[model samples]
Target: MQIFIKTLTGKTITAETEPAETVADLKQKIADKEGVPVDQQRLIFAGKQLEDSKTMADYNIQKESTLHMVLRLRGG
Candidate 1:
């Protein structure tokens, strides 16, 4: 399925993955395609934080669903 993702900066991207794919798998793909490190990515949907071990089906994610991506900010 194809899911639409939106970053904190308002950037939007489309990710294609299987429903059985884990959230960790999706993050890795985004990291490869968008240059955001997997460790720095925090994906949220339906007012809940997505877990790395959970599959897309576990969250009931649908095609074209939007996931909010918040990148971890570095501080001194």
Candidate 2:
């Protein structure tokens, strides 16, 4: 399965996923294209946040889907 990741900073990234894979694995794939660490990223699909282990049923987790991403921002 392949997905397009859209970042909050306005970046487009493409990655491949597996039926039994978690977001953690997805993050790594995106990292190569986005240059952001896994822990620094938070993936969002539809309205739910994607985590490392848990999986969601609703909202499109299917292949060829586009997921939104937001990384932690630093502010003083």
Candidate 3:
């Protein structure tokens, strides 16, 4: 399945993930593709934070669903 994702920096990317893929899986892939650490990436869907242990299906995520990625910052 293909999912649409947007970053806090206004960057957008598409992820090709399996239907059975967990949020953690997607985060790791995004981390690799976008140069952000998985632990530093916060994914939001439908105004809710996505859990690492939860599968895409668990959140009823569908193709083209938009997921927001926020990078965690320190020492602001």
Candidate 4:
């Protein structure tokens, strides 16, 4: 499946990943596309925090779905 991802920086990216792709895998893909570290990403899927190894199937993602893969930022 292909998911259109939006970043916190307002960047839009498209990834053609399996619906069964894990959160870890999606994070890696996002890092690869946006030149960020996977560990630096925090994803919000369906308004819930995702486990590192959680799959889209675990979240009932559909084909050509849209997901948010924003960067993890720290501020005080």
Candidate 5:
């Protein structure tokens, strides 16, 4: 499945991966695609927090799922 994701910085990333890929896997893929680290990645799915052990089936993610990766900003 193809999941179109957007970061907090407004950077859009396209991930053409497997259909049964998990949200965490997608996150890593996005981070890799965008040159980000797994530690700095946070993705929310259907109002629930995404887990590394959570799969598309566990999170109910379907084909062509559009997930959003919220980038964390630290400031004063």
Candidate 6:
């Protein structure tokens, strides 16, 4: 399935993932595109957060799903 990652800075990314791919898998792919560490990435869908251990399917993420991606702040 193909998904969209919209960033807070108005940037967007595309990820072509498998059917059974995990959220962590998507994050890794986004990390490759954004050059941000996986831990810094947060994906939001349906007004909720996505879990790394959960599958994209678990969120009912369909093809062309436009999920928002946010970056975590650095340590204080």
Which ranges of candidate 4 are over 4 A from the true structure?
18-21, 32-36, 73-76
How many steric overlaps does candidate 1 have? 0
TM-score of 1: 0.71
User: After aligning candidate 2 to the native by TM-score, how far in Å is the CA of 69 from where it should be?
Assistant: 1.1
Cα TM-score per model = 0.71, 0.61, 0.71, 0.65, 0.58, 0.68
Pairs in steric clash, model 2: none
- Per-model clash counts, in order, read 0, 0, 0, 0, 0, 0
Q: Tell me the TM-score of model 2.
A: 0.61
Q: How does each model score on lDDT?
A: 0.73, 0.65, 0.73, 0.70, 0.66, 0.72
What is candidate 1's lDDT per residue for 1-76, written digit by digit as tens? Answer: 6778787789887767665556777678767766767877667886898777676688777778778877664344
Cα distance off (Å), candidate 2, residue 12: 1.3
lDDT (C-alpha) at residue 25 in model 5: 71
Residue ranges of candidate 3 with Cα displaced over 4 Å:
32-37, 73-76
Clashing pairs in 6: none
Per-residue C-alpha lDDT of model 6 across residues 33-65, encoded as one tens digit per residue = 667788887678868877765666777767777
Error of 6 at 68 (Å): 0.7
Candidate 4, TM-score vs. the true structure? 0.65
Residue pairs in candidate 5 whose N, alpha carbon or C atoms collide under 3 angstroms: none
Candidate 2 local lDDT, residue 24: 68
